[PDB]
Every structure is written in structure tokens, then in C-alpha cells.
């Protein structure tokens, strides 16, 4: 079974940029749902109940009909927000082979900013904007509701390693930034964890 | 062009159901955003910034490959919240002919008001849950994003006359009930305006 992780920092640690409230409810509530469903439905799935998430949602096609889209759902919804939180954290610098690589497929941090910061934008309803490596070249992609590039093109629409992600869902953002997803964009930059970003380029798996 | 259609009521005419703020917040900056977005795309299709939004959304497949999804998106935000705010208000009734015809086609208003409730809260991210005449039917459905059943089975995977709907997305509810989607829901029944979910039904067209 998943357990729901604990997070790596306070509740306000990365408070002035995202509040208190939203990071104890999206934690404690929405993330735990997301893990509650999923593990209700690997109740009966010994053999894929004993994988990592992350692996799991690399084999949805194998599961049988009935479950495929729950656990897309909610497996996901659990890979996405561990992965989320561990990259998050103030004080950090973008730097080394992972700004050089940003600097080589975007020209500069500034263009990469820009294309991130519209794909998160441009994503309509609920979902995600990610950094992702598909193979030696950097993209910025989208996905839909709790959709990860993990899972394939066929079904997700994208592709590759996820090196960082933003969660676009209306619940990440509400409560401090209402309907401006854009000034809540702008901040993520001064929480986003370069140094578990860089850790994952270099891993590449 | 569009406009903000103005409430037929003061913001906070639905408590304790629905929160003022919210009201406030989805009229005048949502559904505002929708209109403006809609616009912006109609300026250079002057055969169709003429149509009444109802209608412009049953013929989205007339449009330029480029401005499809746009307009979907918007016009569609655009006629679902229009729909949405005349289908609100507190003291109403269901009686007459739509109460019998509720009863004929699910057993009973209990059953009707459960199926309605599952698919509102099965509806993973962001979407609306519907009533729909059908083939001299009454169904339950639900859409995603902004899509509504007007748009036809092909787009948005559900077609019929909406008689009454349920907006779901996290804007909607998470200021007061947060994650708790099926709070929300609840609160629904007390301020669904059956008087005009009955006109609807009586005209079906
Ligand atoms: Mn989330
Ligand atoms: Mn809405």
C-alpha cells in the first residue's frame, strides 16, 4: 500500500509566496485522497500493488478495464503531488549542467521562463505544466487533470522525465491568488527546488 | 459582442447556502474572463459574433480550425454561467408537471436527486453535472472544462436540453467547503431554482 508522505518542511515554510492554509489541506485532505482511492483499488491487484507509483503509472494498459481509470486518476494524483512537494523549497539557485542544458534547448532561463509560464497558463480546467527530458532535449509540456508524462503520450498526450512540475489545479491557488493563476505562476519561481530539480536532471531516471 | 449578463439577484441572496464571496468573485472575475476571452476571438469572425452564445455553441465545428477550442472553452463558459445564475434562488418548489416527470423517469426524487449527486461528484476535475431532456427523457450527465451537452456527443461527450446544472469546479466551492465537494452539493438542493428549471423544461427548446 502507498503511505501519504510527510512533508520535508513546515506548512509556512515557504510562506510569503504560497500560504499556510492551502499547503495543510492540499497535503493533509486533497493528497490523501488521491492515496486513499488508490490504494482501495490495488486492494485486489496484488501484483501491481508491490510496485513504486511512479512505475505503476507506466503500466496503466495492463490493468484490467475496470481499474485502469481510477487508478490513472489517483495513482497519478499521488505520484504527481510527491514529487511536487519534494520540489519545492525557498533559497535555492539555478545553476550548474541543469542551467547550462536550460540555457542550450530554451537560448536563455528568461526564454524558459516564458514557455513554462504560458504552458502553465494556457492549460485549461484542471492539470499540470511540466520540465521535462526526453531523452538528451529539455521540453515544457502540459498535462490534463492529475495526467502525468510518465504514462505516455497515448494516454497523457505527453512524454518524458519529469524534472519539475506546477500543479495548475484551482485547489493549489484559490484561497491567496482566487482566479489569478498568473500572479500565482510568478510566484512559484521563489519556491521552486532548483537543487531537487538539478538532482533529477543528473539521475535522469 | 457579449456582456456580463447582471445577476438576478444580490450577491448575497443565497446565504447561508452559497457565500457571497464567491458569488462575487465568480460573477464579476470568472464568468468576466470568459466573456472578454470570447470576445477577443469573435473580433475578426463577424458572420458568428453576431449569434446569441446558445447558438454559436451548437455550431462550433463552422468555425476556423484555429478558433474551435478557444470559443469552446469561452462561449462555452460563457453560456454555462449565464444558465447557471438564472438557475439559482432560495424558497422554490419542485411541483407540476417536471416533479411527474422526474419521478417517471427515475423512480422518485430521492433516486433522481442520488444519480445526480454521483455524477456531480464523479466528475474528476474540473466540470458540470446536468439535467437533460432527451428523447421525451430525462437523463443525468456530465461534462468536462466548460463543454456543455448543447455542444453535441461528439464534443463534449454528452448531448440533450439542459434543464438545470451544477458547476464543478474547484472556484466554485473551495473558498467555503474546500475539498469537500459533496458539502457543496448538498447545499445545491436548497437554492436549485425549480421555478425555472421547470419553465425550461415546459418550453424544451
Ligand atoms: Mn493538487
Ligand atoms: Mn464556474
Known amino acids: 500500500s502507498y503511505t501519504l508522505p510527510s512533508l520535508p518542511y513546515a506548512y509556512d515554510a515557504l510562506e ?3 500560504d499556510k492554509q ?3 489541506i492540499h497535503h493533509t485532505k486533497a493528497h490523501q485522497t488521491y492515496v486513499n482511492n488508490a490504494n482501495a483499488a490495488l486492494e485486489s491487484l496484488p501484483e501491481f500493488a508491490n510496485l513504486p507509483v511512479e512505475e505503476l503509472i507506466t503500466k496503466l494498459d495492463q490493468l484490467p478495464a475496470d481499474k485502469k481509470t481510477v487508478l490513472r486518476n489517483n495513482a497519478g494524483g ?3 503531488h510527491s514529487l511536487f512537494w519534494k520540489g519545492l523549497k525557498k533559497g535555492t539557485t539555478l545553476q550548474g549542467d541543469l542551467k547550462a542544458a536550460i540555457e542550450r534547448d530554451f537560448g536563455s532561463v528568461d526564454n524558459f521562463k516564458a514557455e513554462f509560464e504560458k504552458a502553465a497558463a494556457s492549460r485549461f ?3 499540470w505544466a511540466w520540465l521535462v527530458l526526453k531523452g538528451d532535449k529539455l521540453a515544457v509540456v502540459s498535462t490534463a487533470n492529475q495526467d502525468s508524462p510518465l504514462m505516455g503520450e497515448a494516454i ?3 512524454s518524458g522525465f519529469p ?5 495548475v489545479w484551482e485547489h493549489a491557488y ?3 491568488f482566487q482566479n489569478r493563476r498568473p500572479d500565482y505562476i510568478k510566484e512559484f519561481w521563489n519556491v521552486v527546488n532548483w537543487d531537487e530539480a538539478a538532482a533529477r536532471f543528473a539521475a535522469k531516471k
Not at 163 to 167: A, E, F, H, R, T
Open 16 to 18: 510569503p509566496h504560497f
Open 22 to 24: 492551502t499547503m495543510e
Open 78 to 80: 499521488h505520484a504527481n
Open 125 to 127: 480546467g484542471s492539470g
Open 156 to 158: 497523457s498526450g505527453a
Open 163 to 167: 524534472i519539475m512540475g506546477l500543479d
Open 174 to 176: 484559490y484561497l491567496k
